[PDB]
């Protein structure tokens, strides 16, 4: 009895870590903003942080206001804040600078400073009630989620081959168990109904399950819903519906949320807000088909 | 010299390193596969390698054959080979010749094993004539390309080690040589793509990476279409930004690619799409090809 929406998640009062991910270009940033907006509107008494773990940030471009290492409120909302981690500035901040910049260019520093962001938030609880992650594409996001488990094993052996580390050692374990708690942490997969997206999404979900990451929600984005004389739209819709049936069959225990390809561009608090409502209440192509042209330009 | 095609690059005989990158979902893999095919077809006398530096590989999905850490020829081609580096398998291999799984799960390892592939490839030349890189999305490709500059600075201050330091400098000078290395940006004519592509090209130039080719992918060309409320609306949006791209990048090769009605997968359909990287796509003439997949 898994409704085709994220209503249970949007109105969830237990989730503390919500990951939004998937193949590149499927709509991770657009979806993670929509989820963040919906939770913020649905639960006005709780504070929400939307962090981008993708090095090439798109949160600022999406809302139209500049974000940085320090969490700032989203203009027009009272309980949603964004954060785009800057490897360069952040390292300059901790040092206080050429060599600092040099360490800042090393691969992995992005996931490390992100984990460090998570880690300092847990210390805060022991701020924001829930944290949504606009993750990088599949490949590097997995390594990030492996970071708790990787640090835990690495840490004890570190101790040996070598007090402050022991406190650190407890915190990593705390993160490790919360990411494996279905009530606390979940991963929302975004995808499009295309051939190359199917196999990577499946491949992503399986690997996430092997990490004990809870995943029960799939957003199928950029759907045409064409069904009346356009050759390309009908051809591509014919393609989309076929794979859409295959997804519904494989993921019958999942929340499979279907989102339309809008005629306008989803930008600003308003259009994101106007789009996100279809993550809460399912999109009806016959009824709500007008909303795809009502986007402000 | 600014022709809206990659004919000059496909028939290039000096380039040894070709990077294909850009924002996610714009079509890096499809384009990097298409470029590799065109070069292979244009230069029968040369062997070409197509490496994927993206951890979530799509070369196998795109061609329909399993590739791995060991380079394999593409079925149906005599001079084109792909390689999908697998971090877990590679590290166990290094251990069995001379902790490995853990280091294989550490963030950045993918960029490290990619550079090692490049680094050991250079050692071989001192083999494939040209190597095409299907890079990861904008954020992490930058980390990878900074690695030569990064390793040099880290390595020199730290102090066979000299031979390694010599190899890094060799890569560093070759990646900054416009005749040897270039970066091809792929993008779509959409707002969020406009600012990330620009941001990426500017950062690449600061690394002394040559970039003079931009692929604008998934264009509708609706006015040229058979003849729709949404398509004309989205093309109207695409054409607006497309004019802006033409204006800003007048020094670049701006190659425009149509949104096909079929799916570009397998050697045949990839080839048929790749031809539009050599001779520009004419919506009035070549409009039938988008349904022949």
């Amino acid at each position, epitope marked *: 009895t898994v409704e085709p929406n994220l209503h249970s998640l949007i109105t969830s009062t237990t989730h503390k870590w919500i990951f939004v991910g998937g193949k590149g270009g499927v709509g991770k940033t657009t979806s993670s903003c929509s989820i963040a907006i919906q939770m913020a509107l649905s639960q006005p008494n709780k504070q929400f942080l939307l962090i981008s773990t993708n090095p090439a940030h798109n949160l600022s471009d999406a809302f139209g206001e500049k974000f940085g290492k320090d969490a700032r409120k989203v203009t027009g909302m009272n309980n949603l804040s964004c954060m785009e981690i800057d490897p360069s500035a952040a390292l300059k901040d901790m040092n206080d600078g050429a060599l600092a910049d040099l360490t800042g260019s090393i691969p992995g520093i992005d996931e490390a400073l992100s984990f460090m962001e998570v880690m300092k938030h847990i210390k805060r609880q022991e701020t924001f009630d829930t944290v949504i992650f606009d993750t990088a594409p599949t490949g590097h996001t997995l390594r990030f989620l492996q970071l708790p488990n990787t640090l835990s094993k690495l840490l004890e052996k570190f101790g040996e081959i070598t007090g402050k580390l022991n406190e650190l050692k407890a915190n990593v374990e705390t993160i490790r168990q919360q990411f494996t708690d279905p009530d606390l942490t979940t991963f929302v997969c975004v995808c499009i109904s295309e051939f190359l997206s199917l196999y990577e999404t499946e491949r992503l979900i399986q690997e996430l399950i092997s990490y004990d990451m809870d995943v029960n929600s799939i957003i199928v984005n950029q759907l045409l819903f064409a069904e009346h004389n356009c050759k390309r739209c009908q051809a591509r819709w014919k393609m989309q519906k076929k794979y859409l049936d295959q997804i519904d069959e494989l993921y019958e225990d999942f929340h499979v949320v279907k989102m339309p390809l809008c005629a306008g561009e989803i930008r600003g608090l308003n259009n994101l807000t106007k789009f996100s409502q279809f993550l809460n209440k399912e999109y009806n192509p016959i009824t709500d088909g007008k909303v795809i042209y009502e986007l402000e330009d | 010299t600014v022709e809206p095609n990659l004919h000059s690059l496909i028939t290039s005989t000096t380039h040894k390193w070709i990077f294909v990158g850009g924002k996610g979902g714009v079509g890096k893999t499809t384009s990097s596969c298409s470029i590799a095919i065109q070069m292979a077809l244009s230069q029968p006398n040369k062997q070409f390698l197509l490496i994927s530096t993206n951890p979530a590989h799509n070369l*196998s999905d795109a061609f329909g054959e399993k590739f791995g850490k060991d380079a394999r020829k593409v079925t149906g081609m005599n001079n084109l080979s792909c390689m999908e580096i697998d971090p877990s398998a590679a590290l166990k291999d290094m251990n069995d010749m001379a902790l490995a799984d853990l280091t294989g799960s550490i963030p950045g390892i993918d960029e490290a094993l990619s550079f090692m592939e490049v680094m050991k490839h250079i050692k071989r030349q001192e083999t494939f004539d040209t190597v095409i890189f299907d890079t990861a999305p904008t954020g992490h490709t930058l980390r990878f390309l900074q690695l030569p500059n990064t390793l040099s600075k880290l390595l020199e201050k730290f102090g066979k080690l000299n031979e390694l330091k010599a190899n890094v400098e060799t890569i560093r000078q070759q990646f900054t040589d416009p005749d040897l290395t270039t970066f091809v940006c792929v993008c779509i004519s959409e707002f969020l793509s406009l600012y990330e592509t620009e941001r990426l090209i500017q950062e690449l130039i600061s690394y002394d990476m040559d970039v003079n080719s931009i692929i604008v992918n998934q264009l509708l060309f609706a006015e040229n279409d058979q003849e729709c409320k949404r398509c004309q609306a989205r093309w109207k949006m695409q054409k607006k930004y497309l004019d802006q791209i033409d204006e800003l990048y007048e020094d670049f090769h701006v190659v425009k690619m149509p949104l096909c009605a079929g799916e570009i997968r397998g050697l045949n359909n990839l080839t048929k799409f790749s031809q539009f990287l050599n001779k520009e796509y004419n919506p009035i003439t070549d409009g039938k090809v988008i349904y022949e997949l």
Partner: antibody, heavy 119, light 109 residues
Framework: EVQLVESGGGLVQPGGSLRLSCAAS????????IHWVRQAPGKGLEWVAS????????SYADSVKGRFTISADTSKNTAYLQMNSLRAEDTAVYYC????????????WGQGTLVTVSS | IQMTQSPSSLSASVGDRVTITCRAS??????VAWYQQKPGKAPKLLIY???SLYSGVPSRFSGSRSGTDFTLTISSLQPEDFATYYC???????????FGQGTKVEIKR
């Protein structure tokens, strides 16, 4: 038309090795899953091994786990079953069958190939 | 995980309603398939996802689910239907495929 064809079945001594092949036609083996199911004389169906080349994933029944290895060569569109340390218990008809990435039901079967383990 | 099929054998006549059941040891959702096999031949797929009729299969073959209990039904048995039937599970959480013990449908006299 979609079809699978087994080959390789024959006589081998207990403890010996034997390699089975399952050649596919009518579909590209990479985007699908291939499964081996065997049936000893008078016994029921027993799944022994499965492979998904698209996800690099493989799985085995415990009865054959350390002894059998399933693989595929996508260039020739063929899957294989490498059997070592064979036992009399392993004597059976070996079928290969196809699965879908979204539906691990077995829709296409080969005719079967006979494996006999005895001295 | 186990798939307990019943009965091991059953006798029936043409036109009879035949019912074969399989109980999963755990919940497998609807991830259950049914097969028919005649001696010396490869199995044929009848039903997938517990209740979905595979293409080309006669309508007299039917599948249904209630919790961990799965039922294969033949509305009006035909002469070509005397054979052995197998249920099969392919739950998402497991890489393993497991078959039921089989049900041999013989001719009653």
């Amino acid at each position: 038309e979609v079809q699978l064809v087994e080959s390789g079945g024959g006589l081998v001594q207990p403890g010996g090795s034997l390699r089975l092949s399952c050649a596919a036609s009518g579909f590209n083996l990479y985007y699908y899953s291939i499964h081996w199911v065997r049936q000893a004389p008078g016994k029921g169906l027993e799944w022994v091994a499965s492979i998904s080349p698209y996800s690099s994933s493989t799985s085995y029944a415990d009865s054959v786990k350390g002894r059998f290895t399933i693989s595929a060569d996508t260039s020739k569109n063929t899957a294989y079953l490498q059997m070592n340390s064979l036992r009399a218990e392993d004597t059976a008809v070996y079928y290969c069958a196809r699965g879908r990435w979204y539906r691990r039901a077995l829709d296409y079967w080969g005719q079967g190939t006979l494996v006999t383990v005895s001295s | 995980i186990q798939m307990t099929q019943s009965p091991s054998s059953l006798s029936a006549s043409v036109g009879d309603r035949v019912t074969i059941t399989c109980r999963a040891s755990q919940s497998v959702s609807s991830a259950v398939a049914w097969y028919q096999q005649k001696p010396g031949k490869a199995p044929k797929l009848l039903i997938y996802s517990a209740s979905s009729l595979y293409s080309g299969v006669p309508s007299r073959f039917s599948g249904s689910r209630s919790g961990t209990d799965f039922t294969l039904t033949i509305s009006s048995l035909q002469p070509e239907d005397f054979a052995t039937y197998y249920c099969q599970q392919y739950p998402y959480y497991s890489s393993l495929i497991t078959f039921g013990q089989g049900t041999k449908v013989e001719i009653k006299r």
